[PDB]
């Protein structure tokens, strides 16, 4: 899992860069299109979750990380059970949602304003997308991606705190 391991290392210094320049990090990432945010959070469900409309730009980013993490956690839980049709169904559905969310996050990056932070986020996201589509992606690779997303979510939470206080 060389590629995902590279992303793990890059996350270590990218979270540092985000901490050093919280303003730049916000400019880099907090450019979500609200219509796309609502659609991604709903997925195939019959209802939009409460109060998404009142979420700030940074809060919408955090909500997308929350949902990606939730879906990836579920996919990891059932990874070894995909011999069963219904388990494979749920696994593929969740992996596809993670792919859609990460794709959207990558599309929101402002490179002119975001500079090195935006470059490194794009690289991390690209590695994740390439891994998610791999037919023979391993459970270990998915677990490392989960850790990356949790670490980055924590970074965004700190950015939010710094902007608001």
Protein backbone atom coordinates (compact mmCIF):
# COMPACT_ATOMS: atom_id res chain seq x y z
CA UNK A 1 0.00 0.00 0.00
CA UNK A 2 2.73 2.46 -1.05
CA UNK A 3 0.34 5.11 -2.42
CA UNK A 4 -1.87 5.24 0.68
CA UNK A 5 1.23 5.27 2.90
CA UNK A 6 2.48 8.30 0.94
CA UNK A 7 -0.87 9.97 1.65
CA UNK A 8 -0.46 9.16 5.37
CA UNK A 9 2.90 10.97 5.44
CA UNK A 10 1.56 13.90 3.40
CA UNK A 11 -1.35 14.24 5.84
CA UNK A 12 1.17 14.64 8.69
CA UNK A 13 2.69 17.80 7.20
CA UNK A 14 -0.51 19.05 5.55
CA UNK A 15 -2.31 19.17 8.91
CA UNK A 16 0.67 21.20 10.20
CA UNK A 17 0.36 23.61 7.26
CA UNK A 18 -3.39 23.96 7.93
CA UNK A 19 -2.62 24.76 11.60
CA UNK A 20 0.01 27.36 10.64
CA UNK A 21 -2.25 29.18 8.17
CA UNK A 22 -5.90 28.60 9.15
CA UNK A 23 -7.01 31.52 6.95
CA UNK A 24 -5.28 30.10 3.85
CA UNK A 25 -6.73 26.65 4.65
CA UNK A 26 -10.27 28.08 4.76
CA UNK A 27 -9.70 29.93 1.45
CA UNK A 28 -8.37 26.68 -0.02
CA UNK A 29 -11.28 24.42 0.90
CA UNK A 30 -14.44 26.21 2.09
CA UNK A 31 -15.87 26.75 -1.41
CA UNK A 32 -18.60 24.11 -1.42
CA UNK A 33 -21.67 24.53 -3.58
CA UNK A 34 -24.58 24.23 -1.11
CA UNK A 35 -26.85 22.39 -3.59
CA UNK A 36 -24.18 19.72 -4.09
CA UNK A 37 -23.62 19.52 -0.31
CA UNK A 38 -27.30 18.73 0.37
CA UNK A 39 -27.43 16.12 -2.39
CA UNK A 40 -24.25 14.40 -1.18
CA UNK A 41 -25.44 14.29 2.41
CA UNK A 42 -28.83 12.83 1.45
CA UNK A 43 -27.44 10.19 -0.94
CA UNK A 44 -30.20 7.70 -1.79
CA UNK A 45 -32.29 8.53 1.30
CA UNK A 46 -35.82 9.97 1.26
CA UNK A 47 -35.06 12.98 3.49
CA UNK A 48 -32.53 15.79 3.78
CA UNK A 49 -30.94 15.91 7.25
CA UNK A 50 -32.01 18.72 9.60
CA UNK A 51 -30.44 22.19 9.65
CA UNK A 52 -27.91 21.73 6.80
CA UNK A 53 -29.22 25.05 5.45
CA UNK A 54 -27.88 26.89 8.52
CA UNK A 55 -24.36 25.40 8.23
CA UNK A 56 -21.54 27.87 7.46
CA UNK A 57 -19.03 27.21 4.62
CA UNK A 58 -16.58 25.51 7.02
CA UNK A 59 -19.41 23.62 8.73
CA UNK A 60 -20.48 22.21 5.35
CA UNK A 61 -16.95 20.91 4.78
CA UNK A 62 -17.03 19.28 8.21
CA UNK A 63 -20.47 17.75 7.46
CA UNK A 64 -19.06 16.19 4.27
CA UNK A 65 -16.11 14.74 6.22
CA UNK A 66 -18.60 13.43 8.84
CA UNK A 67 -20.62 11.63 6.16
CA UNK A 68 -17.56 10.23 4.33
CA UNK A 69 -16.21 8.92 7.65
CA UNK A 70 -19.59 7.34 8.56
CA UNK A 71 -19.83 5.58 5.18
CA UNK A 72 -16.20 4.43 5.15
CA UNK A 73 -16.51 3.09 8.71
CA UNK A 74 -19.51 1.01 7.63
CA UNK A 75 -17.68 -0.22 4.51
CA UNK A 76 -14.69 -1.30 6.67
CA UNK A 77 -17.01 -3.08 9.14
CA UNK A 78 -18.44 -5.27 6.34
CA UNK A 79 -15.33 -5.54 4.09
CA UNK A 80 -14.70 -9.25 4.75
CA UNK A 81 -18.41 -10.14 4.44
CA UNK A 82 -18.94 -9.15 0.77
CA UNK A 83 -19.39 -12.77 -0.33
CA UNK A 84 -23.04 -12.20 0.65
CA UNK A 85 -25.00 -10.25 -1.98
CA UNK A 86 -26.61 -7.83 0.50
CA UNK A 87 -23.26 -7.10 2.17
CA UNK A 88 -21.58 -6.46 -1.20
CA UNK A 89 -24.53 -4.20 -2.08
CA UNK A 90 -24.08 -2.08 1.07
CA UNK A 91 -20.28 -2.06 0.68
CA UNK A 92 -20.39 -0.80 -2.93
CA UNK A 93 -23.07 1.79 -2.05
CA UNK A 94 -20.96 3.20 0.80
CA UNK A 95 -17.66 3.18 -1.13
CA UNK A 96 -19.43 5.03 -3.97
CA UNK A 97 -20.65 7.72 -1.51
CA UNK A 98 -17.13 8.18 -0.15
CA UNK A 99 -15.87 8.54 -3.75
CA UNK A 100 -18.57 11.13 -4.54
CA UNK A 101 -17.83 13.16 -1.40
CA UNK A 102 -14.03 13.15 -1.87
CA UNK A 103 -14.50 14.05 -5.56
CA UNK A 104 -16.63 17.05 -4.51
CA UNK A 105 -14.11 18.14 -1.86
CA UNK A 106 -11.34 18.03 -4.51
CA UNK A 107 -13.53 20.10 -6.88
CA UNK A 108 -13.93 22.81 -4.20
CA UNK A 109 -10.19 23.50 -3.93
CA UNK A 110 -9.05 27.03 -4.79
CA UNK A 111 -5.43 26.73 -5.89
CA UNK A 112 -4.70 30.44 -6.44
CA UNK A 113 -5.61 31.26 -2.83
CA UNK A 114 -4.82 27.90 -1.24
CA UNK A 115 -1.30 27.43 -2.63
CA UNK A 116 0.62 24.55 -0.98
CA UNK A 117 -2.32 23.54 1.25
CA UNK A 118 -4.58 23.20 -1.80
CA UNK A 119 -1.86 21.28 -3.69
CA UNK A 120 -1.37 18.80 -0.87
CA UNK A 121 -5.11 18.34 -0.31
CA UNK A 122 -5.54 17.67 -4.03
CA UNK A 123 -2.79 15.04 -3.90
CA UNK A 124 -4.29 13.36 -0.80
CA UNK A 125 -7.78 13.38 -2.33
CA UNK A 126 -6.44 12.01 -5.65
CA UNK A 127 -4.70 9.11 -3.87
CA UNK A 128 -7.95 8.36 -2.00
CA UNK A 129 -10.00 8.42 -5.23
CA UNK A 130 -7.53 6.14 -6.99
CA UNK A 131 -7.66 3.67 -4.08
CA UNK A 132 -11.48 3.64 -3.84
CA UNK A 133 -11.81 2.57 -7.51
CA UNK A 134 -9.17 -0.19 -7.25
CA UNK A 135 -10.83 -3.58 -7.66
CA UNK A 136 -8.32 -5.13 -5.24
CA UNK A 137 -8.19 -2.32 -2.66
CA UNK A 138 -7.33 -3.83 0.71
CA UNK A 139 -9.00 -3.43 4.09
CA UNK A 140 -5.73 -1.99 5.39
CA UNK A 141 -5.75 0.70 2.68
CA UNK A 142 -9.31 1.68 3.63
CA UNK A 143 -8.39 1.80 7.34
CA UNK A 144 -5.48 4.16 6.58
CA UNK A 145 -7.79 6.36 4.48
CA UNK A 146 -10.22 6.48 7.41
CA UNK A 147 -7.45 7.68 9.71
CA UNK A 148 -6.50 10.34 7.13
CA UNK A 149 -10.08 11.62 6.97
CA UNK A 150 -10.42 11.67 10.77
CA UNK A 151 -7.13 13.57 11.12
CA UNK A 152 -8.14 16.09 8.43
CA UNK A 153 -11.62 16.52 9.97
CA UNK A 154 -9.91 17.37 13.30
CA UNK A 155 -7.80 19.94 11.40
CA UNK A 156 -10.96 21.54 9.91
CA UNK A 157 -12.60 21.63 13.35
CA UNK A 158 -9.57 23.59 14.64
CA UNK A 159 -9.76 25.97 11.65
CA UNK A 160 -13.44 26.59 12.46
CA UNK A 161 -12.56 27.29 16.11
CA UNK A 162 -9.80 29.76 15.13
CA UNK A 163 -12.04 31.61 12.65
CA UNK A 164 -14.90 31.90 15.16
CA UNK A 165 -12.74 32.53 18.26
